[PDB]
PDB file of C-alpha atoms in Angstrom:
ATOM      1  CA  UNK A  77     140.506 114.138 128.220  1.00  0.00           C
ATOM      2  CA  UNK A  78     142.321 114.505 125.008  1.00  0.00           C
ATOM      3  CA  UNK A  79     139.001 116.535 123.300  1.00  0.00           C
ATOM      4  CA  UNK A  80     139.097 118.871 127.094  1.00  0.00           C
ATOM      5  CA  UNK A  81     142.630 119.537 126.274  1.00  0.00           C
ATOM      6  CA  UNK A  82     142.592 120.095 122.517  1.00  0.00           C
ATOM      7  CA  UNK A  83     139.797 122.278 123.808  1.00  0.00           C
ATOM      8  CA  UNK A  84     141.725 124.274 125.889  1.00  0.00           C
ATOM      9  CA  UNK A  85     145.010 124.693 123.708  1.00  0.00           C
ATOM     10  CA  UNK A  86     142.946 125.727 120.679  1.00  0.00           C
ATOM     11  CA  UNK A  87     141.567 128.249 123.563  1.00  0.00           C
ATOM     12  CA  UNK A  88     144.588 129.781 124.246  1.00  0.00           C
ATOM     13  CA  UNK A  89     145.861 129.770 120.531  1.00  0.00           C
ATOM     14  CA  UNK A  90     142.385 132.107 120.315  1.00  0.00           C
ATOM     15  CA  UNK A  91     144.059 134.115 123.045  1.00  0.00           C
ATOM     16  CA  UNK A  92     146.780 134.943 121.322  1.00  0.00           C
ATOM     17  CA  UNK A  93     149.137 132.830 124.129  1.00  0.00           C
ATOM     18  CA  UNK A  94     149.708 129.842 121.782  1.00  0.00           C
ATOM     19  CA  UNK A  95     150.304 126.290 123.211  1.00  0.00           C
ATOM     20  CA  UNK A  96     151.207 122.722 121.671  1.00  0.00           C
ATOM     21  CA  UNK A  97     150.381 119.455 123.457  1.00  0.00           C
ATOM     22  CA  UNK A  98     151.563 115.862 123.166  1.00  0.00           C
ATOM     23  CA  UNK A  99     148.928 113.149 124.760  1.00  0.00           C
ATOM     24  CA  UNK A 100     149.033 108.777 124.375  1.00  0.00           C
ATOM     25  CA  UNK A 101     146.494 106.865 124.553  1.00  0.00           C
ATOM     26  CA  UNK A 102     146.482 103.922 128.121  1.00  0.00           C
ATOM     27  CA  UNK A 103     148.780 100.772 127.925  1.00  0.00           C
ATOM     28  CA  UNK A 104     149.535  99.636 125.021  1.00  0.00           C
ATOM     29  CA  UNK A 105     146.677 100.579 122.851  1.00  0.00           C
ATOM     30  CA  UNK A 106     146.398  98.950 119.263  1.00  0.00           C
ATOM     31  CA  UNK A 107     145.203 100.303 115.778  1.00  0.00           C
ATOM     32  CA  UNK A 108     141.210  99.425 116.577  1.00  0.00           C
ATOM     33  CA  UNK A 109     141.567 101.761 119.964  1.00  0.00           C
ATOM     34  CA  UNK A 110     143.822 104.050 117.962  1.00  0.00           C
ATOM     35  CA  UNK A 111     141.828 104.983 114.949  1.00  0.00           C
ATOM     36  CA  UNK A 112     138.676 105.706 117.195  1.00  0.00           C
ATOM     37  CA  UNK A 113     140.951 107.893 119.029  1.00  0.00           C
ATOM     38  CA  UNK A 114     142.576 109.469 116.028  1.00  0.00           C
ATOM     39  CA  UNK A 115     138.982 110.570 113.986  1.00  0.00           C
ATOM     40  CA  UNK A 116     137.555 112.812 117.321  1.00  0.00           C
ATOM     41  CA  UNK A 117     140.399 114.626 117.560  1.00  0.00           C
ATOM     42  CA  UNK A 118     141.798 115.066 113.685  1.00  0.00           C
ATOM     43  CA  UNK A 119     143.310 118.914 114.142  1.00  0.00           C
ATOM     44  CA  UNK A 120     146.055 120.366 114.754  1.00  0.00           C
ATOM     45  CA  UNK A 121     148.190 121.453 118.057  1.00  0.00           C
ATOM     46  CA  UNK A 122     147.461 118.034 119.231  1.00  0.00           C
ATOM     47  CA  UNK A 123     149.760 114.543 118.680  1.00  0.00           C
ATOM     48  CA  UNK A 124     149.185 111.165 119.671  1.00  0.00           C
ATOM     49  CA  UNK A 125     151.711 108.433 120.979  1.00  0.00           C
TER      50      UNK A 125
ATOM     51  CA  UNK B 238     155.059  97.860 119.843  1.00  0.00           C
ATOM     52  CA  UNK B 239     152.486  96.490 117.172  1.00  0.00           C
ATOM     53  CA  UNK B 240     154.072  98.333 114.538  1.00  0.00           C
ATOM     54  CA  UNK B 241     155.990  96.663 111.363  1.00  0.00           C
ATOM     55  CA  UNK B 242     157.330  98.078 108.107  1.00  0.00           C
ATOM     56  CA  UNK B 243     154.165  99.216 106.673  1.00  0.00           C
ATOM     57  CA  UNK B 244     152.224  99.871 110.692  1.00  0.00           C
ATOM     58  CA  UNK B 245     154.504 102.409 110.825  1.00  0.00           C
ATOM     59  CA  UNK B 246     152.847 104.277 107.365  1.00  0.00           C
ATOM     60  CA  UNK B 247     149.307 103.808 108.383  1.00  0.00           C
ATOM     61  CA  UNK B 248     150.568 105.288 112.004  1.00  0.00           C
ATOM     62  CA  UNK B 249     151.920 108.383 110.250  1.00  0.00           C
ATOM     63  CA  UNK B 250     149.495 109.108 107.564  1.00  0.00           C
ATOM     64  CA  UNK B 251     147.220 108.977 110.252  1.00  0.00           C
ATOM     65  CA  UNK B 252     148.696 111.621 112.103  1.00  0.00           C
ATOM     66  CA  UNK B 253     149.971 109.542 114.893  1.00  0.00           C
ATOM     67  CA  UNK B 254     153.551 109.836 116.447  1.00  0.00           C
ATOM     68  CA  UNK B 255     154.994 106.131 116.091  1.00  0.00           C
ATOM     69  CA  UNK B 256     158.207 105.128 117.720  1.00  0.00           C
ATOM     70  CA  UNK B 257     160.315 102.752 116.318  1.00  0.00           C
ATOM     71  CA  UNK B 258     163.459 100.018 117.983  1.00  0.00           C
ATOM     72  CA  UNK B 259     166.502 100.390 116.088  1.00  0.00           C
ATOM     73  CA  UNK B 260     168.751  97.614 116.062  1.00  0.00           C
ATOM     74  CA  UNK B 261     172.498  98.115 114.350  1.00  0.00           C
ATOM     75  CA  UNK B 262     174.970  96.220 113.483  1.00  0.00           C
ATOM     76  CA  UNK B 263     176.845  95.866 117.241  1.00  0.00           C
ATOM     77  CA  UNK B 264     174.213  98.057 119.271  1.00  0.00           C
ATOM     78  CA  UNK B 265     170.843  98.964 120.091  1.00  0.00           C
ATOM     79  CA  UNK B 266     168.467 101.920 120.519  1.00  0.00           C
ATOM     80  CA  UNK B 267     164.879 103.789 120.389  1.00  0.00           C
ATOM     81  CA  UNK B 268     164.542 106.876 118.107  1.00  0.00           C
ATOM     82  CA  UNK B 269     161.301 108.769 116.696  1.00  0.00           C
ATOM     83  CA  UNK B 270     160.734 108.238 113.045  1.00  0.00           C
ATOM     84  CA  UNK B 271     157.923 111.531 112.322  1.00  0.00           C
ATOM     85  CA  UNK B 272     156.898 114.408 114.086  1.00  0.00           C
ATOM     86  CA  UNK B 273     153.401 114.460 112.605  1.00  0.00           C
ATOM     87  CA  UNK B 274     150.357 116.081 114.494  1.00  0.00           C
ATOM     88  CA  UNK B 275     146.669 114.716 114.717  1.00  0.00           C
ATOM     89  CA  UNK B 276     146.242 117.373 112.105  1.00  0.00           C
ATOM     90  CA  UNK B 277     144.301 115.420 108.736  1.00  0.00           C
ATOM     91  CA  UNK B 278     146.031 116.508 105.775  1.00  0.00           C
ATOM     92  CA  UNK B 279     149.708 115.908 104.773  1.00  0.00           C
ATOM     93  CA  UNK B 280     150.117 118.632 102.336  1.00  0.00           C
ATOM     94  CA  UNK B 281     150.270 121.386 104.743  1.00  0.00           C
ATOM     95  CA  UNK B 282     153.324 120.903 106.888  1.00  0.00           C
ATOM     96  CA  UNK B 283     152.382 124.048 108.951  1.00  0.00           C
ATOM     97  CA  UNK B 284     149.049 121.979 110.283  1.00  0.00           C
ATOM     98  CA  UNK B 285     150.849 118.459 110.105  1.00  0.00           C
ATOM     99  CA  UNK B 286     154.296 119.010 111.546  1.00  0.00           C
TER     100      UNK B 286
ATOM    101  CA  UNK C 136     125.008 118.910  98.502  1.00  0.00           C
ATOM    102  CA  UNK C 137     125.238 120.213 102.737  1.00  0.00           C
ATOM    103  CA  UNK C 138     128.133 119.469 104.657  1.00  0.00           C
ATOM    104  CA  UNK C 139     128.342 115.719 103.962  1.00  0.00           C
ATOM    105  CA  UNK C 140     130.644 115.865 101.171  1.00  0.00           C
ATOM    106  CA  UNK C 141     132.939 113.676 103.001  1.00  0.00           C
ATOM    107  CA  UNK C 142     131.620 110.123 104.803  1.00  0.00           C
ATOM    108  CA  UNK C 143     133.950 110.673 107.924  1.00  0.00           C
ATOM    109  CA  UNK C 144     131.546 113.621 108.420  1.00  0.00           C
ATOM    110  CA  UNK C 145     128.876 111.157 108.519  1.00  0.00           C
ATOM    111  CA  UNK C 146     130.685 108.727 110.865  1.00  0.00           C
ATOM    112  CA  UNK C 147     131.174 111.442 113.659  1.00  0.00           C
ATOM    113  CA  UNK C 148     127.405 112.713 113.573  1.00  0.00           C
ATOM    114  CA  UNK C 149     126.153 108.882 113.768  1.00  0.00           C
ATOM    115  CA  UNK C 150     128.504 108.516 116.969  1.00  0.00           C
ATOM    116  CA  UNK C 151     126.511 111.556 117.909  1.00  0.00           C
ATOM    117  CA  UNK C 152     123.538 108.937 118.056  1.00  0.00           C
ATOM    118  CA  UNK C 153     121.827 107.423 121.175  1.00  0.00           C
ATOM    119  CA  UNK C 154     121.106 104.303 119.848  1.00  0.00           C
ATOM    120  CA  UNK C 155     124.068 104.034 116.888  1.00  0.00           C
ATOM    121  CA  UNK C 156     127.650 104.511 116.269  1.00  0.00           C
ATOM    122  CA  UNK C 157     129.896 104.722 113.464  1.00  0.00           C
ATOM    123  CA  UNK C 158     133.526 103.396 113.078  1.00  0.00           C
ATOM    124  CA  UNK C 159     136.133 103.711 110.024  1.00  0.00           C
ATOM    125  CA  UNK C 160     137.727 100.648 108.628  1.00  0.00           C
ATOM    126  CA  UNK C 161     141.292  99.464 110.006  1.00  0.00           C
ATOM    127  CA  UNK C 162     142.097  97.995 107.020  1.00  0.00           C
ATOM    128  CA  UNK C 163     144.184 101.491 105.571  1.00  0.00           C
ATOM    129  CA  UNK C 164     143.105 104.951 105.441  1.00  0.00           C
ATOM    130  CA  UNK C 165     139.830 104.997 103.487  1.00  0.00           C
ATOM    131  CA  UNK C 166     138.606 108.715 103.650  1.00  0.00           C
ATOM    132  CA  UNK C 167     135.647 108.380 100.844  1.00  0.00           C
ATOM    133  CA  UNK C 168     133.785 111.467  98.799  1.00  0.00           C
ATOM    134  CA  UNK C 169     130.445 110.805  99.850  1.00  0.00           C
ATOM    135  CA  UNK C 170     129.014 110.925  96.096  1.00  0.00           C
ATOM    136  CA  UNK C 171     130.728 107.822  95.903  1.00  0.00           C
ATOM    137  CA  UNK C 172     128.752 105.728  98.106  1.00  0.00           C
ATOM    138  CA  UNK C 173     126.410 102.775  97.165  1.00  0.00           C
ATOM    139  CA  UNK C 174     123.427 100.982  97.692  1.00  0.00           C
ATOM    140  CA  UNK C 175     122.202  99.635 100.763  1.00  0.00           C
ATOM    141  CA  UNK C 176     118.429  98.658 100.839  1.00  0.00           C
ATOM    142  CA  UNK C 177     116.976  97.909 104.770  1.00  0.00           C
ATOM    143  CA  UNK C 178     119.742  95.924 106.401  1.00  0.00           C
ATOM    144  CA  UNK C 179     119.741  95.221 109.717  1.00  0.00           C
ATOM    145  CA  UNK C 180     122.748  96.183 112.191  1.00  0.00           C
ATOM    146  CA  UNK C 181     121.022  94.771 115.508  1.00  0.00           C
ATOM    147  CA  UNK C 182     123.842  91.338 115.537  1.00  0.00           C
ATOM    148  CA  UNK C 183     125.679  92.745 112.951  1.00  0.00           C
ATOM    149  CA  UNK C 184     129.105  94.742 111.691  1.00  0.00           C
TER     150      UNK C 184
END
């Protein structure tokens, strides 16, 4: 869900209606979840938690 | 919260929003210690921040 | 001399594997210029990290 979303922000950036999201990653997630997490989405208009 | 005095570098170099417990003298409270995106690079605050 | 200047570039096109994936170290932010790299001679992955 966070690559659909990063998908769809950096659509409507395209579209000239720009957007910014914020997104976390389950309960409690640690560095080994976080860093898998962290390399397939490494762009901007997204953050992690 | 897994994250110590140096967690909270690898966190934000990362590009990952990191949270911190703040503990004063007489009180307690939660602030946010970055606003950094998932963006890669810190040398471009327009991408990173 | 392609795209593959970087090896984080290589880690998200072996995820793009059936049969393999690739995962960056923990162990602080090691982003590596791919002319860097070193030998590795026919070592098997099957039981192994």
């Amino acid at each position: 869900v966070h690559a659909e979303v990063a998908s769809f922000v950096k659509e409507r950036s395209d579209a000239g209606e720009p957007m910014r999201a914020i997104v976390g990653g389950g309960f409690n997630e640690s560095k080994e979840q976080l860093f898998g997490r962290q390399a397939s989405l490494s762009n901007p208009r997204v953050s992690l938690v | 919260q897994i994250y110590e005095s140096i967690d909270l570098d690898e966190l934000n170099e990362n590009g990952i929003i990191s949270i911190e417990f703040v503990r004063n003298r007489t009180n307690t409270f939660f602030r946010i210690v970055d606003d950094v995106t998932t963006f890669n690079d810190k040398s471009d605050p327009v991408k990173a921040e | 001399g392609g795209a593959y200047d970087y090896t984080n570039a290589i880690i998200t096109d072996i995820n793009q594997l059936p049969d393999f994936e690739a995962k960056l170290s923990p162990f602080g932010d090691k982003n590596l210029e791919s002319s860097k790299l070193d030998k590795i001679e026919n070592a098997n992955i099957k039981d192994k990290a």
